[PDB]
Design a protein around this ligand. Sequence first.
Ligand SMILES: CC[C@@H](C)CNC(=O)[C@H](CC(C)C)NP(=O)(O)CNC(=O)OCc1ccccc1
Ligand SMILES: [Ca+2]
Ligand SMILES: [Ca+2]
Ligand SMILES: [Ca+2]
Ligand SMILES: [Ca+2]
Ligand SMILES: [Zn+2]
Length: 316
Amino acid sequence: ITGTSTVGVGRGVLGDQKNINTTYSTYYYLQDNTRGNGIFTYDAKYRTTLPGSLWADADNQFFASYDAPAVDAHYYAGVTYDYYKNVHNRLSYDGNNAAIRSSVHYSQGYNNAFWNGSQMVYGDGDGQTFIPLSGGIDVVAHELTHAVTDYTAGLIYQNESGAINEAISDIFGTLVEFYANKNPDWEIGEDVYTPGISGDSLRSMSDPAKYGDPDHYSKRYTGTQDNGGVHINSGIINKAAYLISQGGTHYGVSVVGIGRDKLGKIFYRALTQYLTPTSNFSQLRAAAVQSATDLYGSTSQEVASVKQAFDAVGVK
Ligand SMILES: CC[C@@H](C)CNC(=O)[C@H](CC(C)C)NP(=O)(O)CNC(=O)OCc1ccccc1
Ligand SMILES: [Ca+2]
Ligand SMILES: [Ca+2]
Ligand SMILES: [Ca+2]
Ligand SMILES: [Ca+2]
Ligand SMILES: [Zn+2]
């Protein structure tokens, strides 16, 4: 909407206060004009029609329980925009400052979040498996990263290409969590998963097997559930990425860590210059090796570490 840029204040899903960029025209709307062509947050009102209504508030104060998922979807979309722009020189998900749209309060008891081809969508959870999913910065960045993938490599959402698609979203979800630097870790979704159980998460990148996901290609799933295991076989690539950054010895193979920033540079270049819709795990290895070669040179430690990490997870 047309209006003047304002700054509201509210509380997120975990109870933390933050400022939000809003727009005033009769009401205060969740419309941040400070980033690209805007970040827009909508109320789906417990239904499944999308996007719903652009979020309107009478006083620019967002402390009601019903407001909290909107506050966090809006704020964390801003953090994710800032990461891509400041770290990778990428302007929104399409590289041309496309408007970023999110809807919260999707459906009833909805234990998931997704990119629907056009926008982000967040359930509230059922209060047992999840609380409102926009409370997790890694979750928000995971979802916006699906849009980046769809505009770039275009990885088809099934089998190995789909597990790469998922891992790319977990990798950048985690790198955004580290960028914001509030309780960062290599786990996925810990801030919004299972409020009655401490210390768990939906997935682990550092140890995928903790949640039943493979950490080696010989343990890949090849059945048909979950689009051929896209949220399962992602553990193999997540483990490789964790090893590239942090190092370790895995099934006897030692990897020298090169740190998060270089991980992100290597995988961003692979995603945007080398991967294609049909890339498999072996082709990802080749894309990551070439990306590291471009950035650091063929004789670099960075290239050697990429090779070690893929060796450690059984991907040649
Ligand atoms: C219990 C939740 C677990 C088991 C799986 N979900 C996830 O890992 C993350 C959320 C996590 C980070 C909290 N959501 P996603 O991968 O973006 C869901 N993908 C999606 O719906 O694909 C299908 C689709 C395709 C095309 C249009 C529309 C829809
Ligand atoms: Ca208000
Ligand atoms: Ca965390
Ligand atoms: Ca996390
Ligand atoms: Ca938990
Ligand atoms: Zn995903």
